[PDB]
Amino acid sequence: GLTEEQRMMIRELMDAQMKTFDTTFSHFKNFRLPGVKWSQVRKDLKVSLQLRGEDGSVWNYKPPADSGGKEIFSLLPHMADMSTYMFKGIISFAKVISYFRDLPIEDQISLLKGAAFELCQLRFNTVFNAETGTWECGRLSYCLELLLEPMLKFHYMLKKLQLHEEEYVLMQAISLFSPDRPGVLQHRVVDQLQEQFAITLKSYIECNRPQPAHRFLFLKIMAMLTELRSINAQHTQRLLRIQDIHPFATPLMQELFGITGSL
Ligand SMILES: Cc1cc(C)c(S(=O)(=O)Nc2ccc3c(c2)nc(CCCCCCCNC(=O)C[C@]24C[C@H]5C[C@H](C[C@H](C5)C2)C4)n3Cc2ccccc2)c(C)c1
């Protein structure tokens, strides 16, 4: 019940998502693993981790107790490698989309720098098991050892909406094409592009979501996209704080998060 431009546009986002989202994480390899002001940082920073091997073996990691020291950072190198893997997917996803690639390159970079975290969280939501509190990433699993944390309330509430793959990819596009981000020059171009992604989403819900439970679903999604933006800003600052006292960000994280390499 969509216009043909609207069906074309979903098809292109779904295609880009299919080509760049490793749902089984098969190619996440060569990552690091745990071995064998700071008042804010302890409050900023756990997760247990499991690795299924190709042979049927399992390794399980239970994190340490907080004891006022360098043990709260032990999982960060591994998360840095996972995040970098996701960001590569995110960047590839954007580069595949015609509307993104028709922009000037300064703006592309600025948009990617502005939304990478948000698109990473949106992809992670689709592998979040809300019944076990576990992110199920192929051979890897990350389980939580409550919902006062705003990122984590977001994941539970987004998962409760039982969204389609098409709605997830439209949410990704809206977040990507956000005219309100630092260094965007084609402000109005991007705003009009965003408007078409949002209207396609509203029309998609209208056509395939007639049940009373999906009343106001478009508006619920748009408000979660807005929450996710404020959460993005907040988590950008947690990262910078922890990065300041215990460096951990990979070169790709540095580029995406503003770190220049010069003290
Ligand atoms: C200091 C820091 C900051 C940022 C900004 C990033 S990034 O986006 O570049 N990456 C990333 C990647 C995945 C994330 C994530 C952030 N948050 C989340 C949201 C879920 C957890 C909600 C708790 C709210 C924040 N509780 C923290 O203390 C920050 C954490 C820093 C790292 C990564 C992640 C687990 C653990 C270690 C705590 C979030 N998941 C989902 C997830 C978590 C664990 C395994 C798989 C997937 C990193 C790696 C570190």
Numbering used by the authors: 142 to 177, 198 to 206, 210 to 309, 318 to 435
Quote from the publication.
The human pregnane X receptor (PXR, NR1I2) is a transcription factor belonging to the nuclear receptor (NR) family. Indeed, the PXRLBD contains a large and versatile ligand-binding pocket (LBP), which enables it to bind a range of molecules with different structures and chemical properties, thereby fulfilling its biological functions. PXR is traditionally regarded as a xenobiotic receptor, and as such it regulates the transcription of metabolizing enzymes and drug transporters, thereby facilitating the removal of xenobiotics from the body.
In this context, we have also tested the hydrophobic tagging technology (HyT-technology), whereby proteins become unstable and are subsequently degraded by the proteasome following the addition of a hydrophobic group (for example adamantane) to their surface. The difference between the two lies in the size and the chemical nature of the linker, with JMV7035 containing an additional PEG spacer. JMV6995 and JMV7035 mainly interact with the PXRLBD through van der Waals and hydrophobic contacts. In both cases, the mesityl sulfonamide group of the PXR agonist moiety is situated between helices H3 and H11, in close proximity to H12. On the other side of the pocket, the benzyl group is embedded within the aromatic π-trap, which is formed by Phe288, Trp299 and Tyr306.
